[PDB]
């Protein structure tokens, strides 16, 4: 949780932005100037984002996360769904 | 520092817009610190800060959520920003340390700004508090005079004009005989209450701050 | 009983007599004390002291002295306006105690007394370095605006007086069609340089002291 506060008021603007940013970065979506740098080591298993300016680095937001003991798992589990609404969207289209 | 007093020197007063006490702020927010001397009506003050004393004021009120010493300065310059120069502005006017309770957000979760002011002494008020304030009141002073007696002027022109012709033209911007005491009384008693309870200070900001971009010759 | 405080914002600025550099050493003198706010625009000063103290630091500071202090209490209240009290003042603007030395002298044996302002409250500071001088700031500043109201009637009465007939021969000392942002234009890069006097407080008694006795209501 500590990684989600002091985040705002380095990337320094207002309220409404970060938390928009914030989500915006764990979910789809970057901006070109409000870049969510993503600054995921892989080995490591930390994913943050800054967008810096103003004199001084401005750390925009970070994530951090515990790296899976077997990576193909989640991987097969994203791309079956993405095969699976392939699949939904192709017969419901043949439907439509 | 001294860049930021001489800034402050120049850029005008603009009062800090919370709607509370009479804190009539001047605005200089430029890099290595900013100046926002604010004053109470009831205690005085000289904030001229530079961003490491910008920062660590910013952080003696907060508690969780922080930032680079920059990340502070300019995150406080982009709070004047909307609604000065992060539009939320409060105070404690009991404080002998004016810590303007500065509310801004920006994550959602609480954030503490206090545009700290350091308590100025009887040889620091004279930085800010007297050579601009009572420049631009004595140069009032001499404006109050000089329209008086080219009213006066202008007005015996007038009587000399009806003397020599009788024509009346439009009565409404009809001047009366003009009397710089009468004019100072009449100005005392509805003005009064404006001058004497300052409340916004607006009336004094966007109306001295043209005299405030000269009144710095000292 | 606080009067001290009461009567020093209302405190009428006098201008002290010294054979130094006079400053604003201005002070309700009660029979229970006084408060002299020395207010010169350069350092602010502040005898916050009750009768009894300042009586007995006369009789201590008179090395052979046989007199009540009711004796010092009139000598005090002879600097109700601080004039002279007496020998003649002299300040010591280097500090946050003002000694204003009164030689209690009549062609005797030597003598010396003087006053100790120790650090002004910044409250009655604002009292009358911020409140009612903002006030008085304010209401300096309405007044040229509402001056420019009447600058800018009588500009066009004698401008519509002129196009409309009886229009006066001389022309060499008419005034061409005047507005008030003429008269400010020129003010803030003439007057309001050279207006902006903070000068030993003598500028204060000079044009700022009445409107400030205007505005002492608050």
């Known amino acids: 949780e500590s990684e989600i506060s002091q985040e705002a008021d380095d990337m320094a603007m207002e309220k409404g932005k970060y938390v928009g940013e914030l989500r915006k970065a764990l979910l789809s979506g970057a901006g070109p100037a409000d870049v969510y740098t993503f600054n995921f080591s892989k080995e490591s298993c930390y994913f943050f984002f800054e967008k810096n300016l103003k004199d001084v680095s401005f750390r925009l937001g970070s994530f951090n996360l515990e790296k899976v003991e077997n990576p193909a798992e989640v991987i097969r589990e994203l791309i079956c769904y993405c095969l699976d609404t392939i699949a939904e969207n192709q017969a419901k289209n043949e439907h439509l | ?218």
Not at chain 2, 6 to 12: C, E, K, S, T, V
Not at chain 2, 24 to 46: E, M, R
């Open chain 2, 1 to 218: 520092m001294e860049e930021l007093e001489q800034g402050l020197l120049m850029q005008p007063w603009a009062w800090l817009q919370l709607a509370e006490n009479s804190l009539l702020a001047k605005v200089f927010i430029t890099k290595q610190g900013y100046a926002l001397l604010v004053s109470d009506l009831q205690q005085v003050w000289h904030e001229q800060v530079d961003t490491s004393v910008v920062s660590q004021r910013a952080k003696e009120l907060n508690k969780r959520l922080t930032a680079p010493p920059a990340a502070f300065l300019c995150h406080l310059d982009n709070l004047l920003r909307p609604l000065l120069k992060e539009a939320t502005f409060s105070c404690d006017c009991v404080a002998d340390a004016l810590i303007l309770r500065v509310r801004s957000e920006l994550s959602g979760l609480p954030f503490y700004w206090n545009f700290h002011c350091m308590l100025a002494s009887p040889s620091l008020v004279s930085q800010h508090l007297i050579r601009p304030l009572m420049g631009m009141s004595l140069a009032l002073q001499c404006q109050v005079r000089e329209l008086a007696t080219l009213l006066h002027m202008k007005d015996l022109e007038i009587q000399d004009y009806q003397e020599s012709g009788a024509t009346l033209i439009r009565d409404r911007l009809k001047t009366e005989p003009f009397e710089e005491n009468s004019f100072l009384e009449q100005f005392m008693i509805e003005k009064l209450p404006e001058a004497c309870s300052i409340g916004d200070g607006k009336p004094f900001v966007m109306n001295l701050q043209d005299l405030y971009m000269a009144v710095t010759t000292q």
